[PDB]
Amino acid sequence: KFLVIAGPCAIESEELLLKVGEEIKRLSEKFKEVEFVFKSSFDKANRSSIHSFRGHGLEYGVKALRKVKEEFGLKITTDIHESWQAEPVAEVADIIQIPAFLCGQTDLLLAAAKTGRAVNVKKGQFLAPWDTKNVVEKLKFGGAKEIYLTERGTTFGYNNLVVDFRSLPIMKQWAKVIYDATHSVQLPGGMREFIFPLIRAAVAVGCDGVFMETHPEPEKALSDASTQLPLSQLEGIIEAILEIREVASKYYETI
Amino acid sequence: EKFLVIAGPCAIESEELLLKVGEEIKRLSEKFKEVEFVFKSSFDKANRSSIHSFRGHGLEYGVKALRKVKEEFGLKITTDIHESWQAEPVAEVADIIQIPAFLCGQTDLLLAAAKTGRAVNVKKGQFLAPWDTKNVVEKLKFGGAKEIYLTERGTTFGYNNLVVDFRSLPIMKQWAKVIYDATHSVQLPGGMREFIFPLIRAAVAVGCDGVFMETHPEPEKALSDASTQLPLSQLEGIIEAILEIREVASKYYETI
Amino acid sequence: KFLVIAGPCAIESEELLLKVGEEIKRLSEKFKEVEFVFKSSFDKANRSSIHSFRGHGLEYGVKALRKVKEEFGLKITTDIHESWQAEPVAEVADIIQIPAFLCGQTDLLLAAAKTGRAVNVKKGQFLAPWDTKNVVEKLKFGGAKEIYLTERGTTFGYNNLVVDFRSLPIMKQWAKVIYDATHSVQLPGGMREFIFPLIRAAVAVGCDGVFMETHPEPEKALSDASTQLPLSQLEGIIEAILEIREVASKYYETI
Amino acid sequence: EKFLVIAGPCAIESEELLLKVGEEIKRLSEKFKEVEFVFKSSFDKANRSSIHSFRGHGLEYGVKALRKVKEEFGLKITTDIHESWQAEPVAEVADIIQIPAFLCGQTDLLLAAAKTGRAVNVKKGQFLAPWDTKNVVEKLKFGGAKEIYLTERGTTFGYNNLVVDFRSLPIMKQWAKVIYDATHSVQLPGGMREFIFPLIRAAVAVGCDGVFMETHPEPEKALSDASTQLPLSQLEGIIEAILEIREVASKYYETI
């Protein structure tokens, strides 16, 4: 079924995770046709500034995510940054996420694949659509069975990203495709006004799921404040994409 | 608002080809009554890569052929101009005067089109940022244009490649009606037909005021853009699909 | 010999042209090894705003340029924007310049070639280096014998241009290459601080000439105010590029 | 200031290959006394496109081979790290710790290199703007780095292509010494050796603190970057040329 990956950008506190988790649980009950996966990072490994928020550590993060899975019975996903983190994370993560900048790091991919868990690789801003084939092959070599490729924008000049929707049908040739509606509109080193419009495009073209970061009060988020979606708007956007998908799916090309 | 569909053969290879495509467009206009069809075809391809490629049969012949289409089928007409002097004669048959992408900044050409009293559709240059189309519209308004369109046809992305930045649609909608060019946006400067349909679906899901599509009875035999012109028999199905997606997505279109 | 095309961006007045022309004449006498060509546009056909300065017309422009050629005996070059302007311009212009946005307009190229004059085509911001071969062929078809291709930057994201120096050796395969030091640093819709550094790169790589707009008081220019080079700095930059060229020329690849 | 030349085989294919290249570099260091040579070679290619491509013989073997080069030729050494834990062992032989382009933003890796007390050279990411390297340097300084370098190795320009924006050299010089990577800047992601020499000439004419060049006795047989590694016999001539261009251009280098 259609996948929806959502949650707060960073694990600011398990309290925050539980609040967002509650709403995601509710939506989960309202849209039985959709598979929800709760996402949150235990560490922001590449903030621009050394003085910005990174997180509270892997242990605190895995624990908080554990609380969410136990308290709401929701699937979990979080990203790893070095090979050694794959094993401890796979304890609670149903899907291991590979950061865009690290999509080419062979050891990280193999470490993730070895855990037996599903792997979702964010397509690097520097990577061409057809070059993701090699990424998938590495993961298969490492034993991965459930593989996802996430479109999150491509470098377009300086401090700007563009979404080349031709990438969706191309990557679909070798993996399930997810569209990241949050980071695709960000300006490296973004405009929330473009999040919904581009999400509509993604489902009209055809993808296997959408990725969206949401926060009760984006204004106060410790990361991606200007792009995280207000929690109260999540339901409406999901309903909208299911409606558009229902109609457009009739024309999705056979890949 | 009535959705605009601009379609027709890339070039006026012959008056016969035009009537053949025109006949099909006329039939679709009778079916899709919620759509405003505009027949398009260039009397001249002024910037073919090679000096040896087909350009056309001249302005006189072209206007004459386009007039035959309007007279026989009662369809609106659009064609592009390349120099200021062409605006007047072309305005005699063209309901919408098209401004080529490479020429979207030529002040005199814009002014020439504007003073004819006809609608003007400017192809956004492959080098132009979406927010910079504001001054292009300002020039047209200054010149007397009352009905203005901006067409998204891709942006330079490395060498011999174009990418469609759909953020341009809501941005340009701030100052003009927006049209999505489904044919030229997938061509590799100096074409990939498999991406025509998916990208047009994205355009209507995002929200635009119309779509531009070149169609030919037999693309394979086309004298220009043979790789991207849509087979005529496929037009009806594409239009039905974009109307369906437009309908379901419409309640979510943001207000400017 | 090495070509140096210089002059004020636009013909603000024949007075301005004579002042710049005087200095160019002087430099002409100081550097006999260089072929100087005076440049100035009689019309800025694509200003962003309808309210910006365009010029005083073709007649006034051709007349002013005529005064410069007669009073100083300097070669002349100016750009045309529509086919009909080719003939009247060729009366005084030794080199007819084709604007970057119009480098693909067949009739404009043929009209310029038919005049018998030399033709310098500014490479479009949208054009790939290898695609200039077709441009040259069009001009040869039209009778052109002396053909130049000018590097002036390539579209790089929005409102930015990058100079891919690989273009110099590539275009050299079919025409003489000129490097435009002024427009290459401009930000469409620029930083004067990068003009000199990039000029040095151009001569180190290897070109047949340089193009530079200069004005007695750039601060007061009616066009390209932030990028035109102060007249007083022209001599030093020219001396610098001749010195660098003298040394680097030993390594210019055989094309 | 003493010009820096970082050179060596892309990968440590064997300790034998290293000594062969090292011998030539040692000879050039005796001739070009105004140059500070640093021998470079990766103990691991952690991001080859294919899982089937050559990666290396391990960290232990690599450090051992690099140590043999330093001991036998008395040359400075540099190699890249891919994860935080590698910084300590690598710092035992490496005078300069290199940070891969894709990893230029990984805070922990930067911090790990910085606390070793060794110099750190960060390859500017293909996705990073020149002005955004300021925070990368800030992180290193925060971590204890006293000698920092930023290497220009090209920027993403469309698909499978990189362009070198030479404006980056004077921009990055504001906060660190700048090195120009002559090998990777001409490679087509997922190589054009004919552009290596001309672009390196541009780099020195613009002004940099050093150049980075991969060289192999027989590029054709290289296990990595066989298309762009410079034939060893050509190194001397390239170095002489950049020193000559640097000299003549130097009086014109702008002050930061």
Ligand SMILES: O=C[C@H](O)[C@H](O)[C@H](O)COP(=O)(O)O
């Ligand atoms: O503006 C021109 C449009 O891109 C056309 O598709 C153009 O005529 C391309 O022509 P060619 O196939 O000669 O490059």
Ligand SMILES: O=C[C@H](O)[C@H](O)[C@H](O)COP(=O)(O)O
């Ligand atoms: O960062 C990696 C450098 O670009 C190398 O040249 C890299 O290993 C490229 O490898 P491949 O030839 O497998 O794509």
